[PDB]
C-alpha cells in the first residue's frame, strides 16, 4: 500500500496533465509511452538533507564507461564492475533506490551468463557554478560494447535535492538518435557552428524539477541541462525493464 | 623473526640445494633470477585440512581465463573477473595460504588502475580429477592483444601452490628452459601439439620434473613452460602468483 503524490505529466506538444499517483503508476505510465517526462512531488521540505546524508552512500558511470574504447574500456569496466561491488550493498539501503526497488521490485542490473554481477545502482551529484541521450546500448566502440539490446522505454529518474538560484532546469526534446555515432555527429555540428539543425523545428518540453521534486523521463530523447548560476545537488539512475522485471543502473 | 622452513632449490642443469629458508628468503632468490623452482615443506602432516577448510574460502573466474576472451565477450568476463573478486577477497585476504605471503613480503592484491584501485582475484583452490596442457603464465599473455589492458610483462612473475592432497599417481610438474613471447605463441604450441603430439622446441630444452607432496609449497618463474601430469586419483591444491611492482608485492590467481 504505496504512498502518493503530486504528478506533473508531459507530453510533446500536449498541454501538460496534473495528476496525484503513486511511483510505480507514473513509471508505467512512461513504460507504456503514455507520457515523455513526469514530475512528482516526492520529500517534504524539511527532510531532503536527510536523503542526501543517507548512510547507504558510502565515481564511475555507465555513461562514461561508454565513452571509451579498445584496451581503455577493458579497463574502465574493471573499474566500473570493482566499485559497484564495493558501494551497491549500502546504495541498496537509501531511501531513494528503495523508491524503485519498492515500486516495482526492481533489482540493480547484472552482467554474466555464469556468476551475475551488479552494475552501479546510483550516484550523488553536484554541480557547481551540449545535448545526450542515454541508451544502456550506446557505447562507442560498438564491436566491444557487450550490451546491444536498446529499450524503446528506458527511463532516467533523478531526485533534486538542492535547487540553483537560477531556477535552472532541463530541456528535451522530440528527437532519438540512434546511436552512439549518431550522437557523436550532433556534437561534432554542435562544435563547429554552435546549432543542432534538427533541434529548431523539433517539438520540446521544459521542464523545472524543484527540490523535493523526482523527474522521470524518458532518456533516449535528446536533453541537456540548463547552465546554473549556484549549487545544484541531485541523486540519480536508470531503468530499463528487461525480460527478469525492472533493472536500475547509473 | 620469520619462520624457516625445508627448502629444495632447483636450477636448471645442476643439483637441488637444500636449505632451510623463510619465505621471503625463497622469494627474493626467485625474484633475483638466483633460482628455477623452490618446493619448501610448510604444513605439517597434522594440519593440512585445516589450510584448505579456512574459512577465507567460504564463500571464480581467474585471470587466466579472462586472457582468453576477445572484444566484447573480453569486456563481459572482466566485469565478472573484478565484480567477482571484490565479494570473494574479503575472506581471501584472511586465508592462512594468503597470509603466508602477505605476512612475509608485505604482498597486497594486485589492483588495477588505481583513481580507483580495484583488487585482482586473491587466490583459488584448486580440485584436479582424473582426466585421460603446457602453458605459462605472465599478466600481459592476453590474446586479445590490443584490446587486453595489462601490456607489462614481469620477468620474474612467480607461481606459488601448496599442495593439499596427492593423487594416487604422484602427478606433478614438469618445466622446461623455455619461455614463449606471448599468448599467440603458446597457442601455436597448442596448435603444434594437437597436430604432431610434441612440440619441436622443447627437445632442446632442459626440463626439471617436480613431484610436489601434500604440505610442500612449490613457488617457480610461471614465464618458463610447466605442466601437471595426468593424475589417477583427486589432487587439491590452493594457489596464486606473485609479480613485484614498484609499489610492492603484488597477488593475483
Ligand atoms: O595447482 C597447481 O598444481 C599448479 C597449477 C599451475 O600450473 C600454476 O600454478 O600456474
Ligand atoms: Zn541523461
Ligand atoms: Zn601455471
Not at 165 to 185: H, K
Not at 195 to 218: D, S, Y
Not at 221 to 235: D, F, Q, Y
Request: hydrophobic letters at 40%; aromatic letters at 8%.
Amino acid at each position: 500500500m504505496q504512498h502518493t503524490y503530486p504528478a506533473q505529466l508531459m507530453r510533446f506538444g500536449t498541454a501538460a496533465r496534473a495528476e496525484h499517483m503513486t511511483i510505480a503508476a507514473a513509471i508505467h505510465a512512461l513504460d507504456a509511452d503514455e507520457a515523455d517526462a513526469i514530475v512528482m512531488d516526492i520529500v517534504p521540505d524539511g527532510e531532503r538533507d536527510a536523503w542526501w546524508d543517507d548512510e547507504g552512500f558510502s565515481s564511475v558511470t555507465l555513461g562514461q564507461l561508454q565513452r571509451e574504447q579498445g584496451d581503455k574500456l577493458v579497463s574502465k569496466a574493471a573499474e566500473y564492475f570493482g566499485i559497484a561491488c564495493r558501494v551497491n550493498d549500502g546504495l541498496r539501503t537509501t531511501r531513494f533506490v528503495r523508491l524503485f526497488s519498492d515500486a516495482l521490485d526492481a533489482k540493480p542490473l547484472t552482467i554474466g551468463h555464469d556468476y551475475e554481477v551488479e552494475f552501479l545502482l546510483a550516484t550523488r551529484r553536484v554541480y557547481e557554478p551540449a545535448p545526450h541521450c542515454d541508451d544502456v546500448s550506446y557505447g562507442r566502440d560498438t564491436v566491444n560494447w557487450p550490451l546491444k539490446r536498446s529499450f524503446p522505454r528506458q527511463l532516467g529518474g533523478f531526485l533534486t535535492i538542492q535547487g540553483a538560484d537560477n531556477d535552472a532546469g532541463m530541456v528535451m526534446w522530440d528527437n532519438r538518435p540512434e546511436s552512439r555515432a549518431a550522437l557523436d555527429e550532433m556534437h561534432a555540428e554542435y562544435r563547429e557552428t554552435g546549432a543542432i539543425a534538427a533541434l529548431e523545428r523539433a517539438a520540446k518540453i521544459m521542464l523545472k524539477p524543484q527540490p523535493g521534486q523526482l523527474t522521470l523521463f524518458q532518456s533516449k530523447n535528446l536533453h541537456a541541462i540548463e547552465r546554473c548560476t549556484s549549487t545544484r545537488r541531485t541523486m540519480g539512475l536508470f531503468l530499463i525493464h528487461t525480460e527478469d522485471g525492472w533493472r536500475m543502473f547509473d
